[PDB]
Design a protein around this ligand. Structure first.
Ligand SMILES: O=C1C[C@@H](c2ccc(O)cc2)Oc2cc(O)cc(O)c21
Ligand SMILES: O=C1C[C@@H](c2ccc(O)cc2)Oc2cc(O)cc(O)c21
Lengths: 389, 388
């Protein structure tokens, strides 16, 4: 009998939808209270003389709706690395030396927790997606994680570098196709973000760089995705449908350049306005084929780039104020952790749904949406289905 | 009532992922290997290192490269002397070049793939962009989307700092995108520019010098899709894929992006580690197909350098014809990192047509494509040819 490509294809593919079976999260230990951050930040960057700029930064922090963030960087590391405390001193080598180690380390912490929840042998992991906006190396963070966890050497890896804030959507869009197209496939997904690449001193000339110093936090999240769950596996969410789009008239709204001074952040145009103007079109594309037009009838995960995005989306669509609760909770307790945020928010929604005895992992609702927002301006959409509790 | 199970059955494709187009592009500056030691030691103001230049000449003579294409030229190097230093802060100058040049060269390859495919570019649903040359946000995938005028809703996979195995990685990814999504048409672009790694010579790091003899510039693009239309023209089917880390290979190929640019480090014996492990990779790929004669399949191997090809050929007993397409690309283009195996797939189709052979795979049915790179990572793709 001569084996054909059509035979192989039929035997190779999975049957059912991609299913989230575990979520784990991790943060660096140094907890940074937002209410005292202007005083800490102006002191460690030797900027106490800039009293007007410090006032502007206090207003940014006060408006952020962030209570605390976790940071790998602490006073001791900043004292050892004064190039990082300047506005634009040569500092990429110092920042790389930190993040090429700490990004996979924090990833491993999140991944161990996801694997524990999943309750299967790590030898059954067939695919690894590693996503970061913090540093690059060869071999990559995917290779480093494979060694730290002792995954099979034949794990199929997808190394997603320099992605930015929409990529929590991207990794679920990729994991969906890996799980669905490959019988038995189990996909470990890790997003790990460390602000050591982007931390720098303040200047009046670049108030967009300063906004970043108020919002960005550190964290890592991991999920396990697979089709055709075993009886001993415990589904949390199904991945139903995905999209990625570039918003019209958004050119240069969010740019990030990796330079000898590290990663620099640049803002033009009105990000909250552009996202609000365009979000309904994205929802119709996702939900009109499912017969859904009431956006208060679905559970919400939105990347909290800042509070203004969430406020203007809520106001544009007339969401009840409860829809954004899980999202605002993560923003409040962790800040903007770039690609990892939306995965923290998925965990928080499951946890709150359990605590409050709701019927499903999606706050008692059946259908949900997850949005990533970032450079492009790029919007990632993922349609989700909850599981009954 | 619409169910997720009904959505999944309607959403997915039926047939195997099929390569439907290949296009390639290079920068215009052609650099002859026979004169490269004189050129390189002159534009780096290194003519006084006479013993090192003799070592570099021997490296160029053993490379089995006849020529390379380079974005970098004498004018650009005189404008950017920090790039000509062995180790001077120079990443901003390098980034300024590659963040523009990578998507520009990628566009040139993509336009040619799209021309061969013969369909409207509005039907491209997915874009994979792959480079080892620079990073930016938004990425080269965004820049290429804008340059080509693809649909704003194209689904993008930006594959940065990938290294030399990623020619296999982008096919492994394209396969799942095409096969899981009814109607999906995947544009795949690998674009590599050595402005990120070019640097002056020293005698302390002979591994950095080996890079200066082997690495060239180039971009390649493919269209991948399942369930071809009658008006599409298949070239190859993507059958099966694998990625693995070789045992005892830790630190064999490291590359660090620093203030001096991208630095290349070699430990261990790369040709030896690949040769020692290549039969295990072939057995995993081909024993389920009932194939054990590795002279009966067509070959595409990443030409990391000539020693890798020589030692795999000697270990397996490949006939000298097997590595011909691979050696032809190494000779005419050098090591173009991730793009190199796509140039070789094009070369094999082209020679098959020219010589009137029965299939795009040199008249053979089954084939293997190997990527080799940092890890030490080996990518394996099993290919099926199409009849001519
Ligand atoms: O400059 C940065 C910092 C980066 C980041 C955030 C959090 C973290 O923990 C690590 C890195 O996220 C970004 C995301 C962007 O879309 C644009 C940017 O310019 C940046
Ligand atoms: O430092 C480089 C240069 C890079 C490259 C090659 C060709 C090209 O055209 C552009 C970049 O490829 C690499 C591939 C590696 O596995 C390790 C490396 O260190 C490098």
């Amino acid at each position: 009998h001569m084996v054909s490509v059509e035979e192989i294809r039929k035997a190779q593919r999975a049957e059912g939808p991609a299913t989230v079976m575990a979520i784990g999260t991790a943060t660096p230990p140094n907890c940074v209270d937002q209410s005292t951050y202007p005083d800490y930040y102006f002191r460690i960057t030797n900027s106490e003389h800039m009293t007007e700029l410090k006032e502007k930064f206090k207003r940014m922090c006060d408006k952020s709706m962030i209570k605390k963030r976790y940071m790998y960087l602490n006073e001791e590391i900043l004292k050892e690395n004064p190039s990082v405390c300047a506005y634009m001193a040569p500092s990429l080598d110092a920042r790389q030396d930190m993040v090429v180690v700490e990004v996979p380390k924090l990833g491993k912490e999140a991944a161990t927790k996801a694997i524990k929840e999943w309750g299967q042998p790590k030898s059954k992991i067939t695919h690894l997606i590693f996503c970061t906006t913090s540093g690059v190396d060869m071999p990559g963070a995917d290779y480093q994680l494979t060694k730290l966890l002792g995954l099979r050497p034949s794990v199929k890896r997808y190394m997603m570098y320099q992605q930015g804030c929409f990529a929590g959507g991207t990794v679920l869009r990729l994991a969906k196709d890996l799980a669905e197209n490959n019988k038995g496939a189990r996909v470990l997904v890790v997003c790990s973000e460390i602000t050591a690449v982007t931390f720098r001193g303040p200047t009046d000339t670049h108030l967009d760089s300063l906004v970043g110093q108020a919002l960005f936090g550190d964290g890592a999240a991991a999920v396990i995705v697979g089709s055709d769950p075993l009886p001993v596996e415990k589904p949390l969410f199904q991945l139903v449908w995905t999209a990625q789009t570039i918003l019209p008239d958004s050119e240069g709204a969010i740019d990030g350049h990796l330079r000898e001074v590290g990663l620099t952040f640049h803002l033009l145009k009105d990000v909250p306005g552009l996202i609000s103007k365009n979000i309904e079109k994205a929802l119709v594309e996702a939900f009109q084929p499912l017969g859904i037009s009431d956006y208060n009838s679905i559970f919400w995960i939105a990347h909290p780039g800042g509070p203004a995005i969430l406020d203007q989306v809520e106001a544009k669509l007339g969401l009840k104020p409860e829809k954004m609760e899980a999202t605002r909770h993560v923003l409040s307790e962790y800040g903007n952790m770039s690609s990892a945020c939306v995965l923290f928010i998925l965990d928080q929604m499951r946890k709150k749904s359990i605590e409050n005895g709701l019927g499903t992992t999606g706050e008692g609702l059946d259908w949900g949406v997850l949005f990533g927002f970032g450079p492009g301006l790029t919007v990632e959409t993922v349609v989700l289905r909850s599981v009954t509790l």
